[PDB]
PDB file of C-alpha atoms in Angstrom:
ATOM      1  CA  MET A   1      33.356 212.287  62.363  1.00  0.00           C
ATOM      2  CA  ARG A   2      32.616 209.133  60.357  1.00  0.00           C
ATOM      3  CA  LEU A   3      33.493 207.469  57.049  1.00  0.00           C
ATOM      4  CA  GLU A   4      32.099 204.794  54.691  1.00  0.00           C
ATOM      5  CA  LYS A   5      33.153 202.876  51.584  1.00  0.00           C
ATOM      6  CA  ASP A   6      30.787 205.022  49.488  1.00  0.00           C
ATOM      7  CA  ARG A   7      29.578 208.022  51.488  1.00  0.00           C
ATOM      8  CA  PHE A   8      30.527 209.947  54.582  1.00  0.00           C
ATOM      9  CA  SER A   9      28.785 211.612  57.524  1.00  0.00           C
ATOM     10  CA  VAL A  10      29.735 214.080  60.244  1.00  0.00           C
ATOM     11  CA  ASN A  11      27.613 213.843  63.366  1.00  0.00           C
ATOM     12  CA  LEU A  12      27.371 216.281  66.286  1.00  0.00           C
ATOM     13  CA  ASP A  13      25.042 216.118  69.274  1.00  0.00           C
ATOM     14  CA  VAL A  14      23.880 219.679  69.889  1.00  0.00           C
ATOM     15  CA  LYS A  15      20.498 219.042  71.507  1.00  0.00           C
ATOM     16  CA  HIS A  16      18.248 221.951  72.516  1.00  0.00           C
ATOM     17  CA  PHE A  17      20.038 223.889  69.736  1.00  0.00           C
ATOM     18  CA  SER A  18      18.352 225.539  66.753  1.00  0.00           C
ATOM     19  CA  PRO A  19      19.684 226.136  63.186  1.00  0.00           C
ATOM     20  CA  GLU A  20      19.679 229.970  63.218  1.00  0.00           C
ATOM     21  CA  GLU A  21      22.268 229.644  65.982  1.00  0.00           C
ATOM     22  CA  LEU A  22      24.726 227.512  63.965  1.00  0.00           C
ATOM     23  CA  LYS A  23      26.937 228.042  60.889  1.00  0.00           C
ATOM     24  CA  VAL A  24      28.051 225.240  58.550  1.00  0.00           C
ATOM     25  CA  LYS A  25      30.490 226.096  55.791  1.00  0.00           C
ATOM     26  CA  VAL A  26      32.913 224.700  53.233  1.00  0.00           C
ATOM     27  CA  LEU A  27      36.306 226.351  52.784  1.00  0.00           C
ATOM     28  CA  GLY A  28      37.712 224.083  50.091  1.00  0.00           C
ATOM     29  CA  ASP A  29      39.480 221.269  51.902  1.00  0.00           C
ATOM     30  CA  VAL A  30      37.744 221.968  55.200  1.00  0.00           C
ATOM     31  CA  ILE A  31      34.279 221.865  56.759  1.00  0.00           C
ATOM     32  CA  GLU A  32      33.702 224.727  59.175  1.00  0.00           C
ATOM     33  CA  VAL A  33      31.070 224.469  61.927  1.00  0.00           C
ATOM     34  CA  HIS A  34      30.172 227.166  64.476  1.00  0.00           C
ATOM     35  CA  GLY A  35      27.813 226.983  67.438  1.00  0.00           C
ATOM     36  CA  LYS A  36      26.501 229.312  70.126  1.00  0.00           C
ATOM     37  CA  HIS A  37      23.534 229.048  72.480  1.00  0.00           C
ATOM     38  CA  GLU A  38      22.684 231.393  75.317  1.00  0.00           C
ATOM     39  CA  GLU A  39      19.720 229.723  76.990  1.00  0.00           C
ATOM     40  CA  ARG A  40      21.191 231.652  79.939  1.00  0.00           C
ATOM     41  CA  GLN A  41      20.949 230.965  83.710  1.00  0.00           C
ATOM     42  CA  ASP A  42      17.535 229.526  82.809  1.00  0.00           C
ATOM     43  CA  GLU A  43      18.997 225.998  82.889  1.00  0.00           C
ATOM     44  CA  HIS A  44      20.838 225.250  86.160  1.00  0.00           C
ATOM     45  CA  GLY A  45      24.561 225.140  85.864  1.00  0.00           C
ATOM     46  CA  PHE A  46      23.992 227.661  83.115  1.00  0.00           C
ATOM     47  CA  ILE A  47      25.497 226.773  79.803  1.00  0.00           C
ATOM     48  CA  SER A  48      26.792 229.330  77.296  1.00  0.00           C
ATOM     49  CA  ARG A  49      28.082 226.839  74.765  1.00  0.00           C
ATOM     50  CA  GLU A  50      29.818 228.430  71.783  1.00  0.00           C
ATOM     51  CA  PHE A  51      32.571 227.019  69.540  1.00  0.00           C
ATOM     52  CA  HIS A  52      33.998 226.303  66.095  1.00  0.00           C
ATOM     53  CA  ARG A  53      34.843 222.766  64.905  1.00  0.00           C
ATOM     54  CA  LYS A  54      36.602 222.093  61.580  1.00  0.00           C
ATOM     55  CA  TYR A  55      36.972 218.894  59.597  1.00  0.00           C
ATOM     56  CA  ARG A  56      39.079 217.765  56.635  1.00  0.00           C
ATOM     57  CA  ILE A  57      37.207 216.384  53.674  1.00  0.00           C
ATOM     58  CA  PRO A  58      38.387 213.118  52.045  1.00  0.00           C
ATOM     59  CA  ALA A  59      39.916 213.205  48.539  1.00  0.00           C
ATOM     60  CA  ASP A  60      37.094 211.509  46.572  1.00  0.00           C
ATOM     61  CA  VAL A  61      34.572 213.861  48.118  1.00  0.00           C
ATOM     62  CA  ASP A  62      33.539 216.938  46.128  1.00  0.00           C
ATOM     63  CA  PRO A  63      33.883 220.281  48.022  1.00  0.00           C
ATOM     64  CA  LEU A  64      30.370 221.105  46.784  1.00  0.00           C
ATOM     65  CA  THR A  65      27.816 218.290  47.000  1.00  0.00           C
ATOM     66  CA  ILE A  66      27.035 218.376  50.755  1.00  0.00           C
ATOM     67  CA  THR A  67      23.691 217.479  52.345  1.00  0.00           C
ATOM     68  CA  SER A  68      23.748 219.283  55.685  1.00  0.00           C
ATOM     69  CA  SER A  69      20.648 218.071  57.497  1.00  0.00           C
ATOM     70  CA  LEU A  70      19.549 217.866  61.135  1.00  0.00           C
ATOM     71  CA  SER A  71      17.216 215.725  63.233  1.00  0.00           C
ATOM     72  CA  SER A  72      14.463 216.722  65.650  1.00  0.00           C
ATOM     73  CA  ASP A  73      16.597 215.603  68.581  1.00  0.00           C
ATOM     74  CA  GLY A  74      19.248 218.292  68.009  1.00  0.00           C
ATOM     75  CA  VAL A  75      21.872 216.480  65.888  1.00  0.00           C
ATOM     76  CA  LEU A  76      23.872 218.169  63.113  1.00  0.00           C
ATOM     77  CA  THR A  77      24.483 215.868  60.194  1.00  0.00           C
ATOM     78  CA  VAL A  78      26.800 216.652  57.307  1.00  0.00           C
ATOM     79  CA  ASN A  79      26.714 214.448  54.189  1.00  0.00           C
ATOM     80  CA  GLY A  80      28.526 213.829  50.914  1.00  0.00           C
ATOM     81  CA  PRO A  81      29.448 211.405  48.082  1.00  0.00           C
ATOM     82  CA  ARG A  82      32.543 209.385  47.178  1.00  0.00           C
ATOM     83  CA  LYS A  83      34.055 208.694  43.761  1.00  0.00           C
ATOM     84  CA  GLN A  84      36.284 205.732  42.947  1.00  0.00           C
ATOM     85  CA  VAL A  85      37.685 207.969  40.202  1.00  0.00           C
ATOM     86  CA  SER A  86      39.832 206.597  37.400  1.00  0.00           C
ATOM     87  CA  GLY A  87      43.589 206.789  37.211  1.00  0.00           C
ATOM     88  CA  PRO A  88      45.487 204.146  35.255  1.00  0.00           C
ATOM     89  CA  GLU A  89      47.162 202.004  37.950  1.00  0.00           C
ATOM     90  CA  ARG A  90      50.050 204.404  37.742  1.00  0.00           C
ATOM     91  CA  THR A  91      53.326 202.607  38.332  1.00  0.00           C
ATOM     92  CA  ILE A  92      55.359 205.052  40.337  1.00  0.00           C
ATOM     93  CA  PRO A  93      59.135 205.471  39.839  1.00  0.00           C
ATOM     94  CA  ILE A  94      60.886 204.894  43.166  1.00  0.00           C
ATOM     95  CA  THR A  95      64.246 206.724  42.837  1.00  0.00           C
TER      96      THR A  95
ATOM     97  CA  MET B   1      52.402 207.597  57.256  1.00  0.00           C
ATOM     98  CA  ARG B   2      52.913 211.320  57.884  1.00  0.00           C
ATOM     99  CA  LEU B   3      51.349 214.690  57.062  1.00  0.00           C
ATOM    100  CA  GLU B   4      52.331 218.389  56.943  1.00  0.00           C
ATOM    101  CA  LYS B   5      50.683 221.782  56.481  1.00  0.00           C
ATOM    102  CA  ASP B   6      52.112 221.965  52.942  1.00  0.00           C
ATOM    103  CA  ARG B   7      53.476 218.579  51.875  1.00  0.00           C
ATOM    104  CA  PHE B   8      53.209 214.960  52.881  1.00  0.00           C
ATOM    105  CA  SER B   9      55.496 211.941  53.217  1.00  0.00           C
ATOM    106  CA  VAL B  10      55.063 208.192  53.598  1.00  0.00           C
ATOM    107  CA  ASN B  11      57.980 206.451  55.259  1.00  0.00           C
ATOM    108  CA  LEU B  12      58.742 202.722  55.464  1.00  0.00           C
ATOM    109  CA  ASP B  13      61.812 201.046  56.928  1.00  0.00           C
ATOM    110  CA  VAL B  14      62.683 198.208  54.561  1.00  0.00           C
ATOM    111  CA  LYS B  15      66.431 197.936  55.144  1.00  0.00           C
ATOM    112  CA  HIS B  16      68.523 195.418  53.189  1.00  0.00           C
ATOM    113  CA  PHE B  17      65.822 195.745  50.490  1.00  0.00           C
ATOM    114  CA  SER B  18      66.413 196.816  46.888  1.00  0.00           C
ATOM    115  CA  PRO B  19      64.082 198.695  44.461  1.00  0.00           C
ATOM    116  CA  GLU B  20      63.657 195.933  41.836  1.00  0.00           C
ATOM    117  CA  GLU B  21      61.992 193.963  44.629  1.00  0.00           C
ATOM    118  CA  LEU B  22      59.332 196.596  45.433  1.00  0.00           C
ATOM    119  CA  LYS B  23      56.308 198.085  43.623  1.00  0.00           C
ATOM    120  CA  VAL B  24      54.918 201.574  44.301  1.00  0.00           C
ATOM    121  CA  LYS B  25      51.727 202.584  42.542  1.00  0.00           C
ATOM    122  CA  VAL B  26      48.867 205.069  42.467  1.00  0.00           C
ATOM    123  CA  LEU B  27      45.316 203.808  41.970  1.00  0.00           C
ATOM    124  CA  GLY B  28      43.488 207.126  42.124  1.00  0.00           C
ATOM    125  CA  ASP B  29      42.627 207.686  45.766  1.00  0.00           C
ATOM    126  CA  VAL B  30      45.118 205.111  47.007  1.00  0.00           C
ATOM    127  CA  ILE B  31      48.867 204.507  47.160  1.00  0.00           C
ATOM    128  CA  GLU B  32      49.760 200.861  46.641  1.00  0.00           C
ATOM    129  CA  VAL B  33      53.064 199.449  47.929  1.00  0.00           C
ATOM    130  CA  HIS B  34      54.319 195.867  47.525  1.00  0.00           C
ATOM    131  CA  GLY B  35      57.412 194.225  48.978  1.00  0.00           C
ATOM    132  CA  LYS B  36      59.143 190.856  48.805  1.00  0.00           C
ATOM    133  CA  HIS B  37      62.657 189.763  49.738  1.00  0.00           C
ATOM    134  CA  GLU B  38      63.987 186.227  49.782  1.00  0.00           C
ATOM    135  CA  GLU B  39      67.470 186.607  51.229  1.00  0.00           C
ATOM    136  CA  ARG B  40      66.664 183.026  52.280  1.00  0.00           C
ATOM    137  CA  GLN B  41      68.020 180.944  55.209  1.00  0.00           C
ATOM    138  CA  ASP B  42      71.192 182.986  54.651  1.00  0.00           C
ATOM    139  CA  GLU B  43      70.225 185.286  57.543  1.00  0.00           C
ATOM    140  CA  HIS B  44      69.462 183.354  60.758  1.00  0.00           C
ATOM    141  CA  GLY B  45      65.842 183.209  61.669  1.00  0.00           C
ATOM    142  CA  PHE B  46      65.332 183.367  57.934  1.00  0.00           C
ATOM    143  CA  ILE B  47      63.079 186.114  56.749  1.00  0.00           C
ATOM    144  CA  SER B  48      60.855 185.866  53.668  1.00  0.00           C
ATOM    145  CA  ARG B  49      59.207 189.244  54.052  1.00  0.00           C
ATOM    146  CA  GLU B  50      56.540 189.964  51.442  1.00  0.00           C
ATOM    147  CA  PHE B  51      53.454 192.204  51.680  1.00  0.00           C
ATOM    148  CA  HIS B  52      51.219 194.928  50.265  1.00  0.00           C
ATOM    149  CA  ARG B  53      50.487 198.181  52.143  1.00  0.00           C
ATOM    150  CA  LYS B  54      47.965 200.753  50.872  1.00  0.00           C
ATOM    151  CA  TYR B  55      47.428 204.366  51.855  1.00  0.00           C
ATOM    152  CA  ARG B  56      44.725 206.974  51.237  1.00  0.00           C
ATOM    153  CA  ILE B  57      45.848 210.218  49.689  1.00  0.00           C
ATOM    154  CA  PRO B  58      44.644 213.541  51.179  1.00  0.00           C
ATOM    155  CA  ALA B  59      42.202 215.721  49.199  1.00  0.00           C
ATOM    156  CA  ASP B  60      44.542 218.614  48.269  1.00  0.00           C
ATOM    157  CA  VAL B  61      47.107 216.155  46.981  1.00  0.00           C
ATOM    158  CA  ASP B  62      47.187 215.446  43.241  1.00  0.00           C
ATOM    159  CA  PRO B  63      47.002 211.710  42.298  1.00  0.00           C
ATOM    160  CA  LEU B  64      49.914 212.378  39.927  1.00  0.00           C
ATOM    161  CA  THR B  65      52.733 214.534  41.303  1.00  0.00           C
ATOM    162  CA  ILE B  66      54.511 211.973  43.539  1.00  0.00           C
ATOM    163  CA  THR B  67      58.244 211.901  44.292  1.00  0.00           C
ATOM    164  CA  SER B  68      58.910 208.302  45.298  1.00  0.00           C
ATOM    165  CA  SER B  69      62.509 208.275  46.485  1.00  0.00           C
ATOM    166  CA  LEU B  70      64.591 206.038  48.754  1.00  0.00           C
ATOM    167  CA  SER B  71      67.644 206.390  50.987  1.00  0.00           C
ATOM    168  CA  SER B  72      70.827 204.327  51.151  1.00  0.00           C
ATOM    169  CA  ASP B  73      69.733 202.861  54.476  1.00  0.00           C
ATOM    170  CA  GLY B  74      66.737 201.028  52.975  1.00  0.00           C
ATOM    171  CA  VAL B  75      63.854 203.486  53.534  1.00  0.00           C
ATOM    172  CA  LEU B  76      60.982 203.962  51.069  1.00  0.00           C
ATOM    173  CA  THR B  77      59.853 207.550  50.873  1.00  0.00           C
ATOM    174  CA  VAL B  78      56.752 208.715  49.045  1.00  0.00           C
ATOM    175  CA  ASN B  79      56.220 212.451  48.455  1.00  0.00           C
ATOM    176  CA  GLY B  80      53.654 214.944  47.195  1.00  0.00           C
ATOM    177  CA  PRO B  81      52.266 218.525  47.228  1.00  0.00           C
ATOM    178  CA  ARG B  82      49.295 220.237  48.876  1.00  0.00           C
ATOM    179  CA  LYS B  83      46.983 222.914  47.487  1.00  0.00           C
ATOM    180  CA  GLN B  84      44.972 225.337  49.604  1.00  0.00           C
ATOM    181  CA  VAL B  85      42.616 225.470  46.615  1.00  0.00           C
ATOM    182  CA  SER B  86      39.948 228.137  46.283  1.00  0.00           C
ATOM    183  CA  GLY B  87      36.290 227.698  47.067  1.00  0.00           C
ATOM    184  CA  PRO B  88      34.240 230.719  48.108  1.00  0.00           C
ATOM    185  CA  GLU B  89      33.636 230.201  51.853  1.00  0.00           C
ATOM    186  CA  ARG B  90      30.549 228.297  50.860  1.00  0.00           C
ATOM    187  CA  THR B  91      27.794 228.799  53.404  1.00  0.00           C
ATOM    188  CA  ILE B  92      26.131 225.435  53.623  1.00  0.00           C
ATOM    189  CA  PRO B  93      22.343 225.046  54.050  1.00  0.00           C
ATOM    190  CA  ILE B  94      21.663 222.963  57.159  1.00  0.00           C
ATOM    191  CA  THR B  95      18.157 221.496  56.609  1.00  0.00           C
TER     192      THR B  95
END
């Protein structure tokens, strides 16, 4: 949902939502994310919002190392580091 | 320049260009690419095309393992594999 020269961040507005109702997850290359709230006809134009978003990590981002926080105003945040890594400037053979 | 569910491919039209004149390269996360042709005023609307494109590899693609070929019709192709990898479907702690 967002990238930086040193870190990254996925942001989702899911206001009036609460953690027990959501599922974050890391399946290697991907970042799973499931939601589902049944506040029911209580609202007005009732909303039974459920889903399942998935994102692709970036290469220099470790599949582990993920701060998955949240703010008071119902906003899922997913964090992680970047690594410049070291490969000798590898001159590639063009056929 | 292009992606697939199992492999990837970067394609550049650089017709009337020849390998000695170009530089492919892998700097960890990135794929460098330099060009420069001086066919000179020989053409008509002379063209002194030089540059330096750079691409970001995808996570499941090894920084090594890169078939950099080319076709007869002046087209740089850059290839590589993908790996589903294995991480236990890692349930992430949302704060």
